[model samples]
Target: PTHLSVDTKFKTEGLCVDIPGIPKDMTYRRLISMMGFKMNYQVNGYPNMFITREEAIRHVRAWIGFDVEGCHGTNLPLQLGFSTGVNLVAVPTPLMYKGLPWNVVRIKIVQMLSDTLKNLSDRVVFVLWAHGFELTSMKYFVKIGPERTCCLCDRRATCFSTASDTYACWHHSIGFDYVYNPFMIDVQQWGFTGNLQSNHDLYCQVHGNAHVASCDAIMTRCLAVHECFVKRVDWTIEYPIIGDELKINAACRKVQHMVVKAALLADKFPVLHDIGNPKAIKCVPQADVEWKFYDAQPCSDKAYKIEELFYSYHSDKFTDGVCLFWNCNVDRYPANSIVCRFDTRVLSNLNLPGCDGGSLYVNKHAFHTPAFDKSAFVNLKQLPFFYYSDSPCESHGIDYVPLKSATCITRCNLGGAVCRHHANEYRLYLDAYNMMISAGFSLWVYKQFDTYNLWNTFT
Candidate 1:
């Protein structure tokens, strides 16, 4: 990513000019020289721009400005007197600011945000909080609150320190209990949205437990995401949450309906209030190793109200169906779409708008052709959810069902037929194959919710 290398260009005799051992300003001199500039001469074309040592010095200073300044580098939120910012927010820490203790750490954080008066990323607040506590303590404070108290023991102390000094009482000794911090990095945005100050807040809103460091870990990973985006790493894609292990590991695989976005990185998230009964409300499942996060819960107000509006709309295979590919052949019969649910009643009212609301006409051309066998229709293997085209619409179309399988090979030994559309080159009609493919198939294959309790005829 570095366009120029100081190691190769900025060297005098056996010594390096822009070496780390040199001062920042001195290194700037070497860098400018390496970039091809005469310290005393004026720029060849751009007049009025001085070409003196002072000008060279100015150039170096300007170059450093981006590193010393910029949104990611500055901690302006603190300078402006925001508790989470200029005060104690979970924002990014400048590399130059790392390793400094307490007061110095706090000052550097605020200094970074001096520009824009006080506009800094939330990460600065995190760096400030990292001080005066161990990593574990930092996690607690960042996720919950620095002043959070242990209500059971009424001990107003750090959770990490309570183990050493329990309140010596005549009846029973007690200690501090964990609680949610509104200013913590992960839930910071979430907290800003609501007045969440207790473990209960996290439980009800985040669908996460204070007792579990899972969400905190998720937040820490998201910080890396912010760093990747800010730094513009080539390999780092936006919405890196798809690869976030913390969310994937802690989150239930069956999240009903939700959309994962960069904003979800904030402390105050929209769904934090429903952590207790995650299933109580539908959630979109993301961070899955096997699949991208589901775009949104179907039927939710947040569901794609307009075609081509949701993230899934942009997806190629998934849009055409629940198929992983997002968008696929639009001309393909609905039978090829993945069937999330088989009950057709949900789309009974076409008068509604958007995806499920669209008025679907039975293209007489949308006729279904028979495939391998009736057994393939009554029962399916692999759930067919992952295929680019998998849908129950096949059952309702032209009185025929479309069967699918990966086992079908060029010889057509699988005994299934291929369906092709006559008018479209991409469209193909179903032509049956021999029954040889089912040789390896079990009597009953495992399905999403159903079990393979029966053996296949071949089995």
Candidate 2:
């Protein structure tokens, strides 16, 4: 491989430098830091990885109430659902959780996985290796956005109307909620065994005083359920309930419909799905605004300016009004990435089975990658640019200028970078995503990503 020259302007003394027009590396770094800030606050005092392996396992096991059903290893359908069902009050599933778009299980799993990956790398891997075979066997994990037409409102969205490199509110709008529980865990001792101590508290903090073995049982099976739904092949089921959706008569219909749509979409976007597949990903840059809501109420003009210049620029392709602006007051957003949010209102209507609440969950899991940096911007070495620059032109690839790619950075005049690696990592993320879909590396890749815990994908 031809190594980039040590003295090259992009490279500093053995490290990357802060490019003038755009510093993507620094911008990305800020985004991750900001996310960490949120993540810390959201998961404050909860050390998911601080407990004993058994304790940790138990935390996930409680979520698995019906598998044994008072007896041993007899996963009957009736037993799974009503017989020994875990209380929906605290351990809610997408099937029964209302006033929410997703299942409580989803949140718990993400937290558990995040905690495991963030802390108990080895034990998590062992847990996965021992019980994750089912996830590996699946062909793909399909992510189905809300129905094309709002199933609830039946209003045809001007959105989801075309193929976009980006979208605002997907096919529908989303609603979010935070469940706060003070008495869930034995916080102090949860992650103390050379791991995070908060997991115990978070686990115990849930609705019950269930055994740690219960927690493992819950998490492991939940992961299995996800895999089974994706594969859609032969698998033993204690209940007829399919993947994310519950196994009710009504949900059965929706799941069948979603499966068909997901498969077709997957077939169409195979290139984007496969890690080995090569495709040119369009790159765009945006700024991250850390606005103080209490700083000063923006007058009509100023507020409109904030929306038009900063908000709209980041949401749309600068094309028009087509995206949903994130609802944040003074707090910072995790990434300034363009995306479409699924609507819970419409999802609520489908009368879907398992996750009846039609959880309007953001697939942040899709966005999780190696840490981001802003100072060192990407050159979009793979993209093409003809003429749109006042900055010093690059001799080859794109004749574009640089800008402050960071959402937090102030845009002095219309100046920025010709290409920001902002999308590069994600491009690679999608590439890896494709590979995961085609080759089914979800279990290993996620586990490994957590285990190794690299700062960034490229790094």
Candidate 3:
């Protein structure tokens, strides 16, 4: 408490700063800001509070995804991963508890997170897949001090629950705590509205990895690319290690398998389905001097007047595959504002499904106009200027999309997210991943014949 009153030197995690007498209200976020570190950041203004696909691609410096898994019943971090949209840096899971006290182990974990965050400049969109569980992981250790010496058990331990004592818990806190706020995003709330978004597990199992913190971290950013950028923005990631031990250990603990220097290991070709999620994701932050080639692809958002849409018997867009289709129906509104629909069709496999088949689409109906709701008017500003017979209140939710209608289940994200080949399919792939409240499987497995097979546990 007295540290703020005099010339005090506060040091931790192999870093320190000299400071004159400081006021009691200075936060660690601002304190570190002066030190060129961003331990915590506050966001005051993001006009509409939601990012459109274009804004993220053009303005975002990086998509920094964070995922942490703690050892059961303790704040000790077991596995963690940080993704810079380009590289997935993962750390092992079983180190701290190998032979250390809970309190000491906890401090080491906090220090590691703090030091790691310091390396990154304040130019990133911090991603937390599901912010609820991630909330404690991100802040608990940083706020709480050591555990009592008397409290030590494998599965039984009392936690220091003082979300109210700010002085002891870094002087107290406000509701909207953050590591950095300007571009901080969460897939659960931001990417998808409410709990309405599903199949994250499925999408990862089929195309990437999941459950494990690092893989999940990587998966988080990829989806952020989908829901946030909608692939409208082309993001070339920052070119990029000690995080390796973390992942290697994760493999040993029944997590996803990743290797470290195995002796005489060469004949490992023909990766059999998720033996390793995606070959592209396995790509360690290598410098592919030719990354420039994949920069711009054949993709665009065109506008169609009401006359063209209603009159044109056949058009190339309506006929070709659709990936991201957005429709705004103003007929329901009296000329002020209208509701819209956001449809994500096409699977990562790039195939079109018959109306009888289940379409892997995240189509919402009777939705509020992201623009009239005060969202910025993006360039494609397109055919959205027209009208549909349905009003926002008339058509709402998934049932309205008409599973059997050919036109309702159509749209496209041409050229796809990548080479146009392995994209769009993510939508179908994820959509096919029903979670019962959503689904029974994570995602469909990419197998031979470009066919996707379902995968689930029997044990």
Candidate 4:
């Protein structure tokens, strides 16, 4: 394969440089430094690598309750509610693909965090992410591009497309289940464990070998618990929920209804759920402040700029607004999409879910911001980190602390070549998600009782 050259023009820094070629040989660190600013932070020196890895570990430890030692072998946020179930968290891995050396330290950090959260929840929670190929059977782990078979089953295969390519079986096509975790072993320390062909039996053993339901199935099952209430609440929120009316039962009903609606909407729309799916996904680019805040016209001029609305309403930092917008999205759409603007001034007195100050408007003509508030909810954001390395094996991926930052960067900017790779991962994430609906319906439903019920009791 011919070497691909990357040219970067850092507009503000006034730096224009070209990585002309992949040399006959280059140090892993040298190749990685050429990726981008965030990666440059990761590989500028040996010290930087050590520091970042250690920092990553610390973050995971803090989130994992500071007592855990390793991954709990489950996926999903743990300790989310009072339940004692395994906590699941999502993380992406592609080290095995392209035969790059895995960073045992960072991988361990995620694992430990997973274990910690699982113990906290006392229920299984998953931290999942997609990959280019399966490492389930290391022997067949060679890159076959889009022809790779599913890691867990023979029933389904992924076909390549200009839009996106997914790496999940039909049963696991819910998008969330497409993500898997592999144990990181230093091949050197293990000493020449070569030419070993293994079946995905172990992988299946860890990830459950049975065929699971699609997300739609799970939603249907869970919704059937209160289908009439779900329909009614959907219509109720078409306008907004207010105080006095936020009786315990009503709020509880709204929370339950929103949870189901959010998850279903996410399943229906890939663009909403898979944030990193686009190579250069900028639903609204950084330069245009209006779009980012959903204040763009044709909608009401009453649209709110996120920064302005958030800070003025709460006198807090952007992080506060970020938290609120995130909560609004998940509450309104459920793992679907969190892209909306919040006008806190409107709901300054009426406290509600997705309404810090006022009601949030989702997909509101992609115009006005969604209703937002001080209320924070459980989602993928609390995880220590989620990264997608540019050069696999030898170097680290661009790392972001707390899952939300990673989503922000990829969603707002046109990341480099890895963005394309990530775009594919996003497709697989959708696939994993589709599969999750079926496999995780019971889990999601069970988990909802812990958190969703609180909305009703909120004074």
What total of clashing residue pairs does each candidate reach?
85, 75, 26, 70
Model 2 regions more than 4 Å off:
1-207, 210-339, 342-459
Q: Candidate 1 — worst ten consecutive residues by lDDT sum?
A: 60-69
Cα deviation of 62, candidate 2, in Å: 18
Candidate 2 scores a C-alpha RMSD against the true structure in Å of 27.8
lDDT of 4 by residue, 1-459 (tens): 111112311111101111223353433244224322123332212221111212221121111111111122123111111011222222224011111122322233333333333222211111111010111211111112223455456632321111244444323333221122111111111122221112212111212212211121112112221111211223222322322323422332333334433333222222212211123223322221211232212211122333443334422323221221322222322221233223333422222112112222222011122333323223322211122222222222434222222331132122322344454444444344333222211122212222222222212
Error of 3 at 138 (Å): 3.0
Top-TM-score candidate index: 3
Between candidates 3 and 4, the one scoring higher on TM-score is: 3
- Candidate 3 TM-score, C-alpha based: 0.27
Index of the highest-lDDT prediction: 3
lDDT of 1 by residue, 328-435 (tens): 112121222221221111221111111111211111111111111222223223331111121112222222344344522211222345343211111121110011
TM-score of 2: 0.17
Give per-model TM-scores.
Answer: 0.19, 0.17, 0.27, 0.17
Compute the lDDT of residue 395 as modeled in candidate 4. 23
Query: What digit string (tens of lDDT, one per residue) describes model 3 on residues 236-290?
Result: 4221221222232222221111110000011122121111112222221222211
Query: Model 2, 1-459: lDDT tens per residue?
Result: 122111222211111121123332332223223212222333233222112323323222122222211211112111111112222222112122222212433333233333322211111211221111111111111112222333235532212212232222212322211111101112211112321212223222222323333333343333322222222222122222112323222332332232222222222211111111022121111212211111222111101222433453222232221111211111111121111112222222221111111111111111111111221122111111111112232333222234333221111222343244322322333343333223211110110112111112111
Alpha-carbon deviation at 175 in model 2, angstroms: 39
